Amino acid sequence: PMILGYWDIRGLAHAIRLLLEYTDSSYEEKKYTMGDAPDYDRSQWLNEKFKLGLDFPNLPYLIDGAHKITQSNAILCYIARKHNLCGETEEEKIRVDILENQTMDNHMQLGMICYNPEFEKLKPKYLEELPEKLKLYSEFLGKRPWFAGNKITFVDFLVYDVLDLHRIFEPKCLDAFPNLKDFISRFEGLEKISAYMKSSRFLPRPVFSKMAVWGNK
Amino acid sequence: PMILGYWDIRGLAHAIRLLLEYTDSSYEEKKYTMGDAPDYDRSQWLNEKFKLGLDFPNLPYLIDGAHKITQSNAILCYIARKHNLCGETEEEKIRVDILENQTMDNHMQLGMICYNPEFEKLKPKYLEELPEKLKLYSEFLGKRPWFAGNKITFVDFLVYDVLDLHRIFEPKCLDAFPNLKDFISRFEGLEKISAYMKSSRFLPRPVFSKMAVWGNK
């Protein structure tokens, strides 16, 4: 079956794993461990990095038959396209595209402070700006059941991840937005999602790699 | 006509401007000027940020009729979709998706060092890794006329922008890869591209905003 390679971390693979499960895709995972101490040994990966036939060697990666894909969003689309989880109407496609990139932005933004040694200093400012960002997601969603519209698309998996990451980070952030809270519920309530969430496959943490000041383990 | 809003800078709009021209799209540009001095005044934008009706207010933005799009790749896909410039075969679509993300990666990496005050220290290391990055683009293109395959797609506008940027930065970088040199030649050769490159509309630089240590002006 398909093989998903990534660190034994949640990181950028969370949405992919969720999507694979929601779609009944048969896959195996090649987990790569990183070294502890000051020598964050990545050799387990580096030593194999150029032996997989990947055009642009990177983690995560998905190998399906003759297709070797890298870059999160690319893998997400690859799978989504196989199950019609990309927009149908132009309007839907537009919303997918905007979000696909927007979520990647918000994700990296968080990533930058949790890897920066001076995390403690940056944290406050981040927390100040957080309500405005979250607000935007709320207003975008409005009263529809899913971000692209009336049907779940691969982006809901991305949005969910970003939201879940922030509730972990600052537990109270979603409170002022019942809109998002309901969304999270609708998502985790999906038969396949909850079924996966109660298995030994579920890897909700560590959030980031060993070399992070927050979310590591 | 569609209106493209951005700083009066090359930045992330370059590929967009190129795509618009190559496709005959009728558009206008709303250029926002940034302040100099230590008070990098962005009020020109801020004062208007929430008056355009964008879901996720940002630069650049494209406003076509009732469609308001933000995020570079969204704008690019929007225009590309309108003119069949996204992949056709599955294989073409995969290459598009990988490259749409890879180029954005490489773009951001360069950006980070050119905005960081310690640009001088960082430059050498960047230059050391550069030949490897470029090599990957070369091997991926191979003997094909365009990155996606036999037909030009929106990604070529993206790949070109990155290559061009690195040629501006480190003039000799492409030399070891005639593959890429030719590609740039083919691209700049396209009737509409050359026509545009010789107009007053062409805006090859500044590369980055007034607050960058390299590529500013």
SS3 state of residue A28: strand
**Distance between CA atoms of residues A97 and B62, nearest Å:** 13
Domain residue limits, chain B: 1-85+191-217, 86-190
**Distance between CA atoms of residues B15 and A71, nearest Å:** 21
SS3 state of residue A198: coil
Transcribe chain B into DSSP letters: -EEEEEESSSGGGHHHHHHHHHTT--EEEEEEPPP-SSS---HHHHHHHTSS--SS--SSEEEETTEEEESHHHHHHHHHHTTT-S-SSHHHHHHHHHHHHHHHHHHHHHHHHHHSTTHHHHHHHHHHHHHHHHHHHHHHHTT-SBTTBSS--HHHHHHHHHHHHHHHHSTTGGGG-HHHHHHHHHHHHSHHHHHHHTSSS------S-TT-SSS--
Contact A55 B105 (CB under 8 A): no
Superfamily of B1-85+191-217 according to CATH: Glutaredoxin (3.40.30.10)
What DSSP state is assigned to residue A21?
H
Find out whether B52 and B26 touch, Cβ atoms under 8 Å: no
Cβ burial, residue B111 (10 Å; 0-12/13-18/19+) = middle
Contact residues on chain A for B136, CB-CB shorter than 8 A: 55-56
Number of neighbours of residue B180 by Cβ within 10 angstroms: 22
Contact residues on chain B for A78, CB-CB shorter than 8 A: 94, 97
Nearest residue on chain B to A134, judged by CA atoms?
B56
Q: Which of B162, B206, B164 is nearest to B185 (CA)?
A: B164
Cβ burial, residue A199 (10 Å; 0-12/13-18/19+) = exposed
**Distance between CA atoms of residues A62 and A4, nearest Å:** 5
Taking each helix axis as running N to C, give the angle between helix B154-169 and helix B14-22, from 0 to 180 degrees, rounded to the nearest 10: 130
What DSSP state is assigned to residue A149?
B
Q: How many CB pairs under 8 A join A and B?
A: 67
Find out whether B188 and B194 touch, Cβ atoms under 8 Å: yes
Q: Which of A208, A187, A170, A198 is nearest to A11 (CA)?
A: A208
Query: Alpha carbon of A93 to those of A208, B76, B89, B92, B199: distances in Å?
Result: 30, 13, 18, 18, 34
Separation of CA B130 from chain center: 18
Nearest CB among A71, A94, A105 relative to B102 is that of A71
Nearest residue on chain B to A139, judged by CA atoms?
B55
Contact B97 A78 (CB under 8 A): yes
**B67, B93, B97, B133, best to mutate vs chain A, most A CBs in 10 Å:** B97
Contact residues on chain A for B140, CB-CB shorter than 8 A: 55-56
**Distance between CA atoms of residues B2 and A204, nearest Å:** 43
- Which residue shows structure tokens 């000051």? A38
**B55, B70, B159, best to mutate vs chain A, most A CBs in 10 Å:** B55
Nearest residue on chain A to B101, judged by CA atoms?
A71
Q: Which of B90, B85, B81, B103 is nearest to B153 (CA)?
A: B85
What count of Cα atoms within 13 Å lies in the side-chain half-sphere of residue A214?
18
Find out whether B184 and B134 touch, Cβ atoms under 8 Å: no
Nearest CB among A55, A81, A102 relative to B71 is that of A102
- Which residue shows structure tokens 């905007």? A98
- Which residue shows structure tokens 């049907």? A151
Find out whether A20 and A75 touch, Cβ atoms under 8 Å: no
Find out whether B105 and B96 touch, Cβ atoms under 8 Å: no
Find out whether B149 and B91 touch, Cβ atoms under 8 Å: yes
Q: Which of A12, A7, A6, A52 is nearest to A158 (CA)?
A: A12
Cis? peptide before B60, omega within 30° of 0: yes
Find out whether A189 and A197 touch, Cβ atoms under 8 Å: no
Transcribe B84-135 into DSSP letters: T-S-SSHHHHHHHHHHHHHHHHHHHHHHHHHHSTTHHHHHHHHHHHHHHHHH
Question: B147 φ, ψ to 5°?
Answer: -55, -40
The class of domain A86-190 in CATH terms is mainly alpha
Experimental method: X-ray
Find out whether A53 and A47 touch, Cβ atoms under 8 Å: no
**Nearest CA-CA distance, residue B146 and chain A, Å:** 16
Contact A98 B140 (CB under 8 A): no
Cβ contacts of residue B93 below 8 Å, gap of 6+?
A: A77, A81, B86, B87
Resolution at which this structure was determined, Å: 2.7
Transcribe A85-124 into DSSP letters: -S-SSHHHHHHHHHHHHHHHHHHHHHHHHHHSTTHHHHHH
What DSSP state is assigned to residue A67?
E
Query: Alpha carbon of B156 to those of A148, B28, B54, B71: distances in Å?
Result: 28, 23, 28, 18
Nearest CB among B55, B78, B98 relative to A70 is that of B98
**Nearest CA-CA distance, residue A103 and chain B, Å:** 11
Nearest residue on chain A to B139, judged by CA atoms?
A55
Nearest residue on chain B to A93, judged by CA atoms?
B78
SS3 state of residue A213: coil
Cβ burial, residue B75 (10 Å; 0-12/13-18/19+) = buried
Instruction: Give per-residue burial for A157-179: e unless 16+ CB within 10 Å, then b.
Output: bbbbbbbbbbeebeeebbeebeb
Q: Which of A199, A209, A94 is nearest to A153 (CA)?
A: A94
Instruction: Give per-residue burial for B8-22: e unless 16+ CB within 10 Å, then b.
Output: ebbbbbbbbbbbbbb
Taking each helix axis as running N to C, give the angle between helix A90-115 and helix A119-141, from 0 to 180 degrees, rounded to the nearest 10: 170
Query: Alpha carbon of A160 to those of A98, A114, A146, A201, A206: distances in Å?
Result: 15, 19, 10, 18, 17
**Nearest CA-CA distance, residue A168 and chain B, Å:** 24
Chain B: residues touching A (Cβ < 8 Å): 55-56, 67, 69-74, 77-78, 81, 90, 93-94, 97-98, 100-102, 105, 136, 139-140
Contact B78 A69 (CB under 8 A): no
Contact B94 A70 (CB under 8 A): no
Q: Which of B136, B125, B20, B24 is nearest to B78 (CA)?
A: B20
User: Does B209 belong to an annotated binding site?
Assistant: no
> ∠ CA(B135), CA(B141), CA(B147), 5° rounding?
130
Cβ contacts of residue B39 below 8 Å, gap of 6+?
A: none
Contact A90 B102 (CB under 8 A): no
- Which residue shows structure tokens 């709303």? B30
